[PDB]
Amino acid sequence: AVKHLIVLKFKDEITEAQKEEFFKTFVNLVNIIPAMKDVYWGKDVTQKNKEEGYTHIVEVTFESVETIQDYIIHPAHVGFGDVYRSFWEKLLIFDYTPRK
């Protein structure tokens, strides 16, 4: 399985309630985008690199690297971006196959 990892910082003006609604909406995308198999998110608790400012993590599970693209251009994902684009200040994205 492939992981789509999002590391993000919200803009200062976004409230806690707004962040909660943002993540709730994103988690619920799993039901309507076939390529999305699972979602978890969380807030960093350690603040080891404050200077970089990232605060939140989202992890999305996919069957393959190829199905990530199905998710990217799915109208529900495009709609999510259209609605919440103003919420985030910056993000890092990674796509990888977990191994050990």
Next chain:
Amino acid sequence: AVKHLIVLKFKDEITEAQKEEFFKTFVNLVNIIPAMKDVYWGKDVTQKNKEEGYTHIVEVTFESVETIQDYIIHPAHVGFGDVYRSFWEKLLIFDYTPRK
């Protein structure tokens, strides 16, 4: 469960074989550090983050936020840093509880 996420970039002179052995050794820490419950790593394939350059992800599972400290100061973890810190150029650390 709490996840301990390491986001890394290697120095340019580090070989592919060195990277593989680095992760093999890191994964094997589970056997000698009780607090480590699981580990996976992976290499980003998308390279969508222009200015930051991080290439690899390590995720370690812990039973609680408290047991992360048992890993942090464990001599096997300190030793890993002493042997391999010259391998990485920079790293970001995050600790979070995955949720819906």
